[PDB]
Amino acid sequence: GSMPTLLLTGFEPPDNPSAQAAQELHGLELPGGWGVHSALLPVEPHAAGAALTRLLSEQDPGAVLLTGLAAGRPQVTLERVGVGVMDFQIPDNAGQTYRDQPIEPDAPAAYLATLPLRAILAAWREAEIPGDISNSAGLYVCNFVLYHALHWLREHGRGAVPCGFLHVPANAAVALAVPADRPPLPYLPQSEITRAVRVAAEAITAQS
Amino acid sequence: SMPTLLLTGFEPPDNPSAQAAQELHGLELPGGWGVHSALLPVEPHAAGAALTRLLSEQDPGAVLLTGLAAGRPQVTLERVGVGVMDFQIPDNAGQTYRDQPIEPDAPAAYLATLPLRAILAAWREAEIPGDISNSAGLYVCNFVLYHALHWLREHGRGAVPCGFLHVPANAAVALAVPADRPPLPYLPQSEITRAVRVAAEAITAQS
Amino acid sequence: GSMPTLLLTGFEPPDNPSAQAAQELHGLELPGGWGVHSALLPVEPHAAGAALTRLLSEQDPGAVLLTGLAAGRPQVTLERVGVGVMDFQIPDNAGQTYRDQPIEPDAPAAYLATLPLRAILAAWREAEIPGDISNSAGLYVCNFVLYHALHWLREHGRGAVPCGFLHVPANAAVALAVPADRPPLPYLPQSEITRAVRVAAEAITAQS
Amino acid sequence: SMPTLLLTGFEPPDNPSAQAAQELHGLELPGGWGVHSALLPVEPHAAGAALTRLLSEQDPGAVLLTGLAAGRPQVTLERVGVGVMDFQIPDNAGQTYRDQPIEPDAPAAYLATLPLRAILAAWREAEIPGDISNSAGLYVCNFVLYHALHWLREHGRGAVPCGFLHVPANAAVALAVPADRPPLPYLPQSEITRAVRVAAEAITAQS
């Protein structure tokens, strides 16, 4: 409200470590008067866009950290770019798919994330957390909300609000649920994942 | 005066994109189309200067940029060129860039304008596995994709289909891997060249 | 018969590059009077063992090159060891599975392959074929027939007959049949696979 | 006089198997069992000599050998120790071996005698993903597995459960990867140590 807010999102669930990290960190007080406000987004792009727009409008955040599961990635990553296309390798939770679909007619092909990427990487390394920048978020709902948030902020004169996406590995639950015929997944204990999201949130607000 | 497909690869020790471009130079395709091949240096400033000259002098009806993606198992088509330079390894001048925008006050990205699904279908009909890639890296390969798409748009030639085709290692690239590193997926060069040719034929058939 | 025979096996098929390589190379004449005799084995261990025993007895080969598909491997490989256990990650073609099952009571835990492994690797490299030694054949039917063949040969006083296993990558057909939700496979054109089997066969008989 | 589980790791720069063994030394388990930990050098001849002494002097009721398998995503149990030494990288003495039999007129392999399925189930109950591995490599890790299983059999102690547990990289191992190499799967050291502990408890509960 009157104090600076970092908006932290995860995706609603079988198991989703981004939801668990967002839920645990809701209300976290950070230095400089900053507070974390967490929300879960549905895994369907139209409903996720509508929900994220409401959060951006109602919470008026000073920074936006969107998070999601990237099952198969070994380490936390920061997305460099949100691409203005929807192309689903798997259906969303409404059973729907998109193929080569522009997110918005006559909008940029992409938005670069505006989080302090190198500062977050350095904060992770100081906390003994391996991590890196990713240059594709996929074209599923995760990428969609990154593009949606960056576009909304720019169109409302808030392009200076740092905004980006943080993909997290599988947690133990995700890895344990992999069928026996599929390859084993890299994973992290949920406490490691949540700590990485926290360290990133703290780095973002310290810079901003 | 006849329609030209500009086909580029990167200069080498071994580079399958160079070998494919060299073999396909001068190929005649249906509808009057001819392939004009050129090799680009693996240094972005010189590569950009060389590609601008090719785009200007050859005035191509379509642009197929190719390069090696050592480690990928199958040919891929790049969906998007990103306006950032960020090198994990030096270029051939020993130079690296860090989060560097390619051009001030230019788009963050350009989408490739090749007929992607048409190429994938032509590959599948030719028994060639392949797919669309959604990141070209931020090395010289990505740089020339962004460079070409930007140049075409800025010269009123945005309708010229233009994109990037990454190819696997060939046998030579895989054989040169040191014993301490993991083995690479690879394709015989004849498979790689045939995939480039099939993509070229699909591109000109649409236009 | 009166001339030295290299016994070359592949596995019966959707698509199997080891079957195609074995079928193409049947009857190949090699230097020194050697001829390739090819046969396809079923993908069920009991029937495969019975069929391989008959081939070993009836063909009386001077060398044995067993081959099979290893979908996901990028390059041809030579198996170092056949392990005396059956443990199936997927059912065989009879719908059957085994778990931690010894192949034969009171038999060795393993047999090392007796092919000239380094000579084959060198012949591959001279032919511009990347390849390597593998130290596990899995515990599916492929490993089973390697162990079965090595055991049979030793128990019949023919331990000196060079015998081993050659795994081949997916061919184009195998890679094209992968569902859209699964990761893309390394593959080789069938002509590359068949040539690698041929080069290995030629190296084996030149040494023996 | 009380039953001893011998727990080994390998001496380092960073090795999670060493850290797990050091933390668990002296752990009391139900049924009177105690963990005795030792670190082995990463040179096979010295490692074999050190392990033989531990087996002889500690007379353990079970043997849990552990080591780092940088690149594996989850803890694994080795099914088989192969009687061959073949090093892709030098040991700590700068030495390599090529297709070298570990011992003349000895078995080609020994199967591990740990209760593998019981350990996997204990891991799953503790929310730890894991699996059986069917090759330990042919480096020092495999060497000590074969060495221990052979020594136990040759001293009439084949019934002593004995096996190998490979662990992923920890954070330190993953952070030390150079920028040109691909990122490693990893686990926080506390997860790795807990997996070793759970395996140890499952082993002693069966015996």
PDB file of N, CA and C in Angstrom, chain A residues 75 118 121 125 131-133, chain B residues 86-90 96 98 181, chain D residues 173-184:
ATOM      1  N   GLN A  75      19.137 -26.205 -11.740  1.00  0.00           N
ATOM      2  CA  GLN A  75      19.425 -25.078 -10.870  1.00  0.00           C
ATOM      3  C   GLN A  75      18.426 -23.967 -11.139  1.00  0.00           C
ATOM      4  N   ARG A 118      22.279  -9.717 -13.032  1.00  0.00           N
ATOM      5  CA  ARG A 118      23.610 -10.025 -12.525  1.00  0.00           C
ATOM      6  C   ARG A 118      23.676  -9.891 -11.006  1.00  0.00           C
ATOM      7  N   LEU A 121      22.250 -13.111  -9.588  1.00  0.00           N
ATOM      8  CA  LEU A 121      23.230 -14.190  -9.725  1.00  0.00           C
ATOM      9  C   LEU A 121      24.326 -14.068  -8.675  1.00  0.00           C
ATOM     10  N   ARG A 125      25.202 -16.664  -5.679  1.00  0.00           N
ATOM     11  CA  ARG A 125      26.519 -17.264  -5.491  1.00  0.00           C
ATOM     12  C   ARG A 125      27.049 -16.991  -4.087  1.00  0.00           C
ATOM     13  N   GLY A 131      23.245 -20.994 -10.007  1.00  0.00           N
ATOM     14  CA  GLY A 131      22.130 -20.484 -10.797  1.00  0.00           C
ATOM     15  C   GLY A 131      22.635 -19.805 -12.051  1.00  0.00           C
ATOM     16  N   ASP A 132      21.707 -19.459 -12.936  1.00  0.00           N
ATOM     17  CA  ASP A 132      22.147 -18.826 -14.177  1.00  0.00           C
ATOM     18  C   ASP A 132      20.990 -18.101 -14.841  1.00  0.00           C
ATOM     19  N   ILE A 133      21.318 -17.375 -15.895  1.00  0.00           N
ATOM     20  CA  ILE A 133      20.322 -16.762 -16.762  1.00  0.00           C
ATOM     21  C   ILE A 133      19.928 -17.779 -17.824  1.00  0.00           C
TER      22      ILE A 133
ATOM     23  N   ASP B  86      25.778 -11.878 -25.726  1.00  0.00           N
ATOM     24  CA  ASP B  86      26.285 -12.378 -24.448  1.00  0.00           C
ATOM     25  C   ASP B  86      26.991 -13.697 -24.719  1.00  0.00           C
ATOM     26  N   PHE B  87      28.316 -13.673 -24.687  1.00  0.00           N
ATOM     27  CA  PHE B  87      29.127 -14.775 -25.178  1.00  0.00           C
ATOM     28  C   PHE B  87      29.589 -15.624 -24.000  1.00  0.00           C
ATOM     29  N   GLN B  88      29.243 -16.914 -24.024  1.00  0.00           N
ATOM     30  CA  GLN B  88      29.803 -17.850 -23.052  1.00  0.00           C
ATOM     31  C   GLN B  88      31.245 -18.208 -23.390  1.00  0.00           C
ATOM     32  N   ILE B  89      31.602 -18.177 -24.669  1.00  0.00           N
ATOM     33  CA  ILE B  89      32.971 -18.420 -25.120  1.00  0.00           C
ATOM     34  C   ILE B  89      33.380 -17.270 -26.033  1.00  0.00           C
ATOM     35  N   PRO B  90      34.671 -16.953 -26.130  1.00  0.00           N
ATOM     36  CA  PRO B  90      35.100 -15.882 -27.037  1.00  0.00           C
ATOM     37  C   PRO B  90      34.756 -16.192 -28.486  1.00  0.00           C
ATOM     38  N   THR B  96      34.628 -11.211 -26.009  1.00  0.00           N
ATOM     39  CA  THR B  96      33.354 -11.557 -25.398  1.00  0.00           C
ATOM     40  C   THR B  96      32.530 -10.289 -25.205  1.00  0.00           C
ATOM     41  N   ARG B  98      28.924  -8.929 -22.805  1.00  0.00           N
ATOM     42  CA  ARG B  98      28.153  -9.194 -21.587  1.00  0.00           C
ATOM     43  C   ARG B  98      26.867  -8.371 -21.606  1.00  0.00           C
ATOM     44  N   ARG B 181      35.345 -35.054 -22.072  1.00  0.00           N
ATOM     45  CA  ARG B 181      34.023 -34.476 -22.279  1.00  0.00           C
ATOM     46  C   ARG B 181      33.047 -35.524 -22.808  1.00  0.00           C
TER      47      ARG B 181
ATOM     48  N   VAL D 173      30.468 -28.315  -5.190  1.00  0.00           N
ATOM     49  CA  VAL D 173      30.879 -28.943  -6.445  1.00  0.00           C
ATOM     50  C   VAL D 173      30.226 -28.249  -7.638  1.00  0.00           C
ATOM     51  N   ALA D 174      28.921 -27.961  -7.549  1.00  0.00           N
ATOM     52  CA  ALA D 174      28.235 -27.315  -8.665  1.00  0.00           C
ATOM     53  C   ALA D 174      28.736 -25.890  -8.894  1.00  0.00           C
ATOM     54  N   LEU D 175      29.019 -25.148  -7.816  1.00  0.00           N
ATOM     55  CA  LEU D 175      29.490 -23.774  -7.959  1.00  0.00           C
ATOM     56  C   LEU D 175      30.878 -23.695  -8.574  1.00  0.00           C
ATOM     57  N   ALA D 176      31.678 -24.760  -8.451  1.00  0.00           N
ATOM     58  CA  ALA D 176      33.040 -24.781  -8.971  1.00  0.00           C
ATOM     59  C   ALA D 176      33.107 -25.157 -10.449  1.00  0.00           C
ATOM     60  N   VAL D 177      31.984 -25.513 -11.063  1.00  0.00           N
ATOM     61  CA  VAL D 177      31.979 -25.843 -12.496  1.00  0.00           C
ATOM     62  C   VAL D 177      32.382 -24.613 -13.306  1.00  0.00           C
ATOM     63  N   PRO D 178      33.333 -24.728 -14.232  1.00  0.00           N
ATOM     64  CA  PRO D 178      33.707 -23.575 -15.055  1.00  0.00           C
ATOM     65  C   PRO D 178      32.555 -23.126 -15.943  1.00  0.00           C
ATOM     66  N   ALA D 179      32.624 -21.859 -16.358  1.00  0.00           N
ATOM     67  CA  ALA D 179      31.535 -21.257 -17.119  1.00  0.00           C
ATOM     68  C   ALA D 179      31.333 -21.911 -18.481  1.00  0.00           C
ATOM     69  N   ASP D 180      32.344 -22.596 -19.011  1.00  0.00           N
ATOM     70  CA  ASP D 180      32.219 -23.208 -20.327  1.00  0.00           C
ATOM     71  C   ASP D 180      31.553 -24.580 -20.295  1.00  0.00           C
ATOM     72  N   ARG D 181      31.415 -25.202 -19.116  1.00  0.00           N
ATOM     73  CA  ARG D 181      30.823 -26.525 -18.968  1.00  0.00           C
ATOM     74  C   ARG D 181      29.369 -26.424 -18.515  1.00  0.00           C
ATOM     75  N   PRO D 182      28.555 -27.461 -18.763  1.00  0.00           N
ATOM     76  CA  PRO D 182      27.126 -27.346 -18.469  1.00  0.00           C
ATOM     77  C   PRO D 182      26.863 -27.452 -16.979  1.00  0.00           C
ATOM     78  N   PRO D 183      25.800 -26.822 -16.486  1.00  0.00           N
ATOM     79  CA  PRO D 183      25.525 -26.872 -15.050  1.00  0.00           C
ATOM     80  C   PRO D 183      25.205 -28.287 -14.614  1.00  0.00           C
ATOM     81  N   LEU D 184      25.598 -28.601 -13.356  1.00  0.00           N
ATOM     82  CA  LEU D 184      25.442 -29.914 -12.757  1.00  0.00           C
ATOM     83  C   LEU D 184      24.167 -29.985 -11.934  1.00  0.00           C
TER      84      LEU D 184
END
